[PDB]
Design a binder for this molecule. Sequence first.
Ligand SMILES: N[C@@H](CCC(=O)Nc1ccc(OC[C@@H](O)c2ccccc2)cc1)C(=O)O
Ligand SMILES: [Yb+3]
Ligand SMILES: [Yb+3]
Ligand SMILES: [Yb+3]
Ligand SMILES: [Zn+2]
Length: 610
Amino acid sequence: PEIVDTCSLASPASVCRTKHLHLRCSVDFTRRTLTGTAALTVQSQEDNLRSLVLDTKDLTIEKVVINGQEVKYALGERQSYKGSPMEISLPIALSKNQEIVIEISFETSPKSSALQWLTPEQTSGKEHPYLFSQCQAIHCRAILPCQDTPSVKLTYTAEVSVPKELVALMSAIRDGETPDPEDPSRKIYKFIQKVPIPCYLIALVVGALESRQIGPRTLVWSEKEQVEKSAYEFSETESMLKIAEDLGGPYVWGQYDLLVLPPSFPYGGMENPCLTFVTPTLLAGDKSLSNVIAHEISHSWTGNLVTNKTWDHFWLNEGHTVYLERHICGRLFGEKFRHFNALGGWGELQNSVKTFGETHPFTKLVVDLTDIDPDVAYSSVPYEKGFALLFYLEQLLGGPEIFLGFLKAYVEKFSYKSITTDDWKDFLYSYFKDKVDVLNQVDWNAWLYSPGLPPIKPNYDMTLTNACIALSQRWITAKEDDLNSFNATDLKDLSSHQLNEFLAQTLQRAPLPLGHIKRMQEVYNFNAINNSEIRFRWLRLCIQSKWEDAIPLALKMATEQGRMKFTRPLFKDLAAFDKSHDQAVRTYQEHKASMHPVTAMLVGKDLKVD
Ligand SMILES: N[C@@H](CCC(=O)Nc1ccc(OC[C@@H](O)c2ccccc2)cc1)C(=O)O
Ligand SMILES: [Yb+3]
Ligand SMILES: [Yb+3]
Ligand SMILES: [Yb+3]
Ligand SMILES: [Zn+2]
């Protein structure tokens, strides 16, 4: 038995394992480069090892040093999105289990697909620049040479130099600050990560950062003007950490800090160990998007502790994480709320399947990513098909109490390791050996490997959903003589989550007649709502229903923030509406140079330009 990562060009885990990284680097805002040395401790897994291969993407290599001597190296030609393979020739041949430190002096490209450089005018303070990393899935190679695969896990110590008036933070514990020994006006921040992580969890941020304390092991980081709203928005963090510890075992990372990025941050969150990255679009002003925090918190076990071996098995990361997320929200707000969110996720699943097509290879639970850019295939499917499976099994195996017992053991058995769907399923059968017959009733083939909607829908409690269906249906079937009965009172007992679910449900039946959508704004005033989730679905409904007045609103939102879940479909909807098409394409061309590289490439492909 042997399994290879088809997203990596580096030497595989069965040949050699990276065990440690010493990073010393300089952050240069003038050149937009990351400069420095990456010292890799490498353990050989076979006898007679003469050379290894590492991943790179648009990297400049200065020199390769092994034991104080320069050695031979060769970069192969670029294989599109995978980058360029780097063969390093070792001077002394390695036996099984032997270690060598390989020091690579590197410079990053200004166009690194891992990083976004912000000018002062692109930030909030407007006086200092900004940089952030997003390595997931395979962008770490665009920062440093590494085995860019989640099948390898490594500790790391880092030392990064930044201008005196800026703060560096990494996916590690802060080791304190001391001025550069060979310095301009600079500060050299030190970091240590004692826990072995996959390299996609390596992260760096540099900007005019200030912090506020909101929990015993939690600090919110952001620019001065965001720190206030953030401290309030995420107050529930420690209480979420506590419930997550009860569900998955002890939290091993020591510290759980949050960082609120610039609006161009491409995701809801990123579970960078010790330092969760979140979008500023979470700042609703009422804590209502805090499920995203629960999500990143849950990754401290499912994802960061037990890690997908290859990206083919991404669903292990996200399925279990969404499962724990919804349990945190459930234990906080009630079991009925947990069902409401679970049904809404099925809803999102339905949408991804309709969008891709019910026979699309990207709707499979386990996808073959041979010659597929992980960024193109990314969707809600692994999240929600993954949640549905676990949810279904939970109901099948006798409830959440029993299944959370499996979950805890699963985290315990596979902690600090990298696993496949098969390891998971094999452990499932091992744990529930008293229930093998029940497990053989499940259509494993269809769930794991079939496209489309799952072969079976779980059971959902409907308490909080009914009012959403009632109202959505009323609008969807509305005629002229219903329009005057619609009223602000329709919304009186609805939470922001229910409002969102109402719009999601109505969006599935778009377009609605223009007159009806105009009447919707007349009676509900959905334009005045700043909740990003609500605004997003609302503006999509408007654009898809041919409302011209919504064009500048959707244009504003699509470019005033970068979160791909909002930005991409807004651009797509605006391209599909003939009134806005030209303007959508023009707006993207003006904004693309100052957008995030991954977001730019994706929106560009969405729009069929370049
Ligand atoms: N982890 C964060 C979001 C950023 C992220 O997951 N990045 C990312 C990007 C591309 C990926 O690609 C693999 C993906 O294309 C895929 C799709 C379907 C099935 C398996 C894998 C995986 C993760 C979070 O959950 O809050
Ligand atoms: Yb150089
Ligand atoms: Yb340079
Ligand atoms: Yb009627
Ligand atoms: Zn996740």
